[PDB]
Write a protein that binds this DNA or RNA. Structure first.
Ligand SMILES: [K+]
Ligand SMILES: [K+]
Ligand SMILES: [K+]
Ligand SMILES: [K+]
Ligand SMILES: [K+]
Ligand SMILES: [K+]
Ligand SMILES: [Mg+2]
Ligand SMILES: [Mg+2]
Ligand SMILES: [Mg+2]
Ligand SMILES: [Mg+2]
Lengths: 124, 193, 100, 208, 126
RNA sequence: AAUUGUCGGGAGGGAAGCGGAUGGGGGCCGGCGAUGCGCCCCGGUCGGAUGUGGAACGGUGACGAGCCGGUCCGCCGAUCGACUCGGGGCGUGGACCAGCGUGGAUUGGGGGGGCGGCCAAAGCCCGGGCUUUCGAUACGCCCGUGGAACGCCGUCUCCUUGAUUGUGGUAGGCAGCGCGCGCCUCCGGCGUGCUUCGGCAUCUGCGCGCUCCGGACGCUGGCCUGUGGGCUCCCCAUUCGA
RNA sequence: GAUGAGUAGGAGGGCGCGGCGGUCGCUGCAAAACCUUGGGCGCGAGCCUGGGCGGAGCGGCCGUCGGUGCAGAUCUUGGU
């Protein structure tokens, strides 16, 4: 015998792939698996890990909060693994470069009118 | 250089003993700085303190062996588990044979056989240990990086004793096997390796 | 930006051979073992040849006076080693112990 | 060209001399001196271009696996020290089991060439495996026996009737063998009689 | 066809795992069922009792599912289905489904002979 | 299906059945177990350029140009290639099962040698002195750089053996070492430095090779329709378990 | 590379039955069912197949659904 807990095996469970059946999400997962393997980038690793997460673990970000966080960094590409929703409490929308899994119609229209772009993760 | 150093050390010890006799006094040998400890009892029906100490010593299986630097703390820890282990002062031959035949290094928490000096260099290169002989010298002399080298060494998985044991339920002093058998651990290592 | 592709990572584990038996593995792990073995064999051959020829030298590491001092010290040490107590502290058992 | 080995081997894989002595004996210093303090550089041998193999007539649907290189090459079979030319051997197996024969030489394949002689016990020039033979202490002079032209190819099958040439060769070889045997008294009877184990005979105690 | 498989087939156990007491009670069938009784000696693995199957008996993956002839089985219902094995004749053999008629079996056999595809039961309904 | 009759096989000293291992008998199996491959000669069929025209068409580009390209058909030269076409020669070759050889891994034995430590062994023997006994002719002590042979412990090494086993399949890698690149009188010797005076990874570079070197290869035999080989099938017997 | 006990209990991956939406097939040159010291695959639930009988239908695969898996209940009915 060997004095080990559960024979030395792990007892923690984490996501290793998306539980969703979305083919586009699967393709994104393949893309970022390749990126993580062949670049060793911490950003890519974080993106890959978040691509596996459930719905409640990918909460949306409001447009007003996005503007507040992007203030002073409009030249950088803001990236969220989740949805971006419109906020009727935000009056002035600056030009922003935004990447997300999905945009609501109102948020996309407001960003495009303000002069930004809505990007997917392949474009990112 | 290491071989010359070992030979010179043995000669110096003999000369010191002889000169002490000639002067008519006594020469007290330096206390052992290194111990080799072998677990001799199974994992059944373990007391909490004994089990915890054996885990801290990295002796999780019967007939596992490990080196241990001699310290007040380590000696007091070993005193608590004395009935479950037998230990002593390893020889240069014992250490060399153990590392050569059953020496496995820990790389990324994996057990890799020491088939090349590159395995040792990858882990202990920062400390100047890049060869099996360097590792042996560090272990035997208890050098500055002894802790790193010893932790790098995976616990030795020794076979059952070739000639058996006398009685593992009694101390070595009473004619059993448990406890400190000092210089006599080397013959046990011969039979167990 | 991708790092260079790797094709030689999936190498089969090298079989472990005991250096104490085969020479090549021992030399690979420790080249000085070759010199150690050569010197040991040559020294043994020289000793055997000297013993056979019976022309061995008469070597004296220690001079005569120091050898005599060593012998005297050893004799004194052996005498104290075999020395025994007088057993005079046990008065009630003097006759039984034979001190008288 | 050096006519003697520079470094005799104390044991297998260890030389008697060290690297410095080997340098001195090989004379690398001499070569450096003669070439001007620098070793002569020799260009790598040019590889032979592969032949223009004709295109295959078939294309397999699977990629056959090429075995990995094995670096071990077999060595010649060893001959036991107890077996020397002229030694009397006891056959332990086959149709001639128990027969006592004379050993002549070891062939290239490692088998032992033996003769009865044929007249004495009916055993012809034959090959016997060393593993099925017992070497005795009895030796007979075989200096006058010539078996140079006999080798492993003598017994090769051409694939019922024994050629007369083989019989003549056996007679010629056995003439000298029998003449040598006649010198030792009772050796004729010894060779004509087979070996057998009787009651209370222990092979592990018999000396042979 | 020369089979591609080279490793020898090794079976850790060739005996069936028969249900306990199926020899005793007719109503108890042979198909394996793991005992769940609290006192069951078979469940407790008492020596000399019925053996229970476990993953340790698993076949070597290289030789798994390989028939004694060195090929793998594939059930074919018609000659059209037969052609799927054209590029795998060194690893796969065809077995004609039990319900195929003799008339179609003849055509399947002829096509397999043309394609060098091994049939395990080519003599059926002949 | 339970259950029953008949025939055939088999077993049975106060249960039967069952797990594991062989064996006897029976039953079954020919993808159960190959006969091809390469190089030549002869004969028979089918096609043969990078040349020249036609039919349709493709890759890329931009479902444009340009460039490149394959399939089929018709001709001048070229006189070659192929055939699961036939015949004749040389070489080589299969499944399974055994024996043997040389080696790797793991492991259990047997026979030696060198060195060191000890009261710098103890003892024994050789000489020089002292001592003088009851189990009567002893115990004995030291002086010699006196001499052989051990004992235990430790350590370094050589040789020789039995057993189980070959997992992988694109590497001439790593480590160590020989021959040539100089000569002589070739069991060896000749140069520069450091040495404990024995020796030393100090000079140690290339080409070609060898090995205990990134996991077994080689040879021979038996047999292939047989009273052969195999079996997870069936009935039994036996040892152990139950 | 390390490792392997499991009642109550939890979970994962699989086997099997009957329908529905699709898809690919089999069958009077013999389907289902049943029978068989024929053979084989899988650790296993099970599956594939030879032979027989039977004499009219049946199966694989992807989704999806359910009155979907028995050795027991002094269980039910029938039979012995
Ligand atoms: K039953
Ligand atoms: K289990
Ligand atoms: K072997
Ligand atoms: K269907
Ligand atoms: K069946
Ligand atoms: K269904
Ligand atoms: Mg272990
Ligand atoms: Mg106790
Ligand atoms: Mg019935
Ligand atoms: Mg229903």
């Amino acid at each position: 015998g060997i004095d080990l807990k559960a024979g030395g095996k792990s007892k923690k469970t984490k996501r290793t792939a998306p539980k969703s059946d979305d083919v586009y999400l699967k393709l994104l997962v393949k893309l970022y698996r390749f990126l993580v393997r062949r670049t060793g980038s911490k950003f890519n690793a974080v993106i890959l890990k978040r691509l596996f997460m459930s719905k409640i673990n990918k909460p949306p970000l409001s447009l007003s909060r996005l503007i507040s966080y992007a203030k002073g960094k409009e030249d950088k590409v803001v990236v969220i693994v989740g949805t971006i929703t419109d906020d009727v409490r935000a009056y002035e929308v600056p030009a922003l470069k935004v990447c997300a899994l999905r945009f609501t119609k109102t948020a996309r229209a407001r960003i495009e009118k303000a002069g930004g772009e809505c990007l997917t993760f392949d474009q990112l | 250089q290491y071989a010359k150093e070992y030979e010179a050390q043995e000669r110096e010890l003999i000369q010191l003993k002889r000169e002490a006799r000639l002067k008519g006094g006594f020469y007290v040998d330096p206390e052992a700085k290194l111990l080799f400890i072998i677990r001799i009892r199974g994992i059944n029906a373990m007391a909490p303190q004994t089990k915890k100490i054996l885990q801290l010593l990295r002796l999780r299986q019967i007939f596992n062996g490990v080196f241990l630097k001699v310290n007040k703390a380590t000696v007091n820890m070993l005193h608590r588990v004395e009935p479950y282990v037998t230990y002593g002062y390893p020889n240069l031959k014992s250490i060399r044979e153990l590392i050569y035949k059953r020496g496995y290094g820990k790389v990324e928490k994996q057990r890799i056989a020491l088939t090349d000096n590159s395995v040792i260099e990858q882990v202990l290169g920062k400390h100047g240990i890049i060869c099996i002989e360097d590792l042996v010298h560090e272990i035997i002399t208890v050098g500055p990086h002894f802790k790193e080298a010893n932790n790098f060494l995976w616990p030795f998985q020794l076979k059952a004793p070739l000639g058996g044991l006398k009685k593992k339920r009694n101390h070595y002093v009473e004619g059993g096997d448990a406890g400190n058998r000092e210089n006599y651990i080397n013959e046990l290592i011969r039979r167990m390796n | 930006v991708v790092r260079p592709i790797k094709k030689d990572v999936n190498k089969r584990a090298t079989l472990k051979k005991n250096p104490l038996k085969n020479l090549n593995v021992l030399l690979k792990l420790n080249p000085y073992a070759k010199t150690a073995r050569r010197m040991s064999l040559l020294a043994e051959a020289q000793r055997v040849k000297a013993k056979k020829e019976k022309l061995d030298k008469k070597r004296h590491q220690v001079t005569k006076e120091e050898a005599s001092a060593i012998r005297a010290a050893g004799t004194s040490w052996f005498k104290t080693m075999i020395s025994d107590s007088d057993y005079t502290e046990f008065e009630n058992f003097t006759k039984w112990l034979g001190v008288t | 060209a050096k006519k003697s080995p520079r470094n005799p081997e104390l044991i297998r894989g260890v030389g008697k001399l060290s690297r410095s002595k080997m340098y001195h004996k090989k004379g690398l210093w001499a070569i450096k001196k003669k070439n001007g303090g620098s070793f002569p550089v020799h260009k790598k041998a040019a590889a032979v271009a592969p032949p223009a193999v004709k295109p295959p007539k078939f294309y397999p649907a699977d990629d056959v696996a090429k075995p990995l290189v094995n670096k071990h090459k077999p060595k010649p079979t060893k001959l036991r020290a107890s077996i020397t030319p002229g030694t009397v051997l006891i056959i332990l197996a086959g149709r001639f089991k128990g027969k006592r024969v004379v050993f002549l030489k070891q062939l290239k394949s490692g088998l032992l060439l033996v003769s009865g002689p044929f007249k004495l016990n009916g055993v012809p020039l034959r090959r016997v495996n060393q593993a099925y033979v017992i070497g005795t202490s009895t030796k007979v002079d075989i200096s006058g026996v010539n078996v140079e032209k006999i080798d492993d190819k003598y017994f090769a099958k051409q694939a019922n009737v024994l050629p007369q040439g083989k019989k003549d060769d056996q007679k010629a070889v056995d003439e000298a063998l029998i003449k040598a045997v006649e010198c030792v008294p009772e050796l004729k009877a010894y060779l004509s009689a087979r070996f057998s184990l009787k009651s209370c005979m222990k092979p592990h105690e018999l000396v042979f | 066809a020369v089979p591609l498989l080279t490793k020898k087939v090794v079976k850790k156990r060739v005996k069936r795992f028969i249900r306990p007491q199926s020899d005793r009670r007719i109503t108890v069938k042979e198909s394996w069922r793991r005992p769940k009784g609290i006192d069951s000696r078979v469940r407790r693995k008492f020596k000399g009792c019925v053996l229970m199957p476990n993953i340790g008996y698993g076949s070597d993956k290289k030789t798994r599912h390989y028939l004694p002839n060195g090929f793998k089985k594939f059930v074919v219902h018609n000659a059209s289905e037969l052609e799927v094995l054209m590029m795998h004749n060194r690893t796969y053999c065809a077995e004609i489904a039990h319900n195929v008629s003799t008339r179609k079996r003849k055509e399947i056999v002829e096509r397999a002979a043309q394609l060098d595809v091994v049939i395990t039961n080519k003599l059926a309904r002949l």
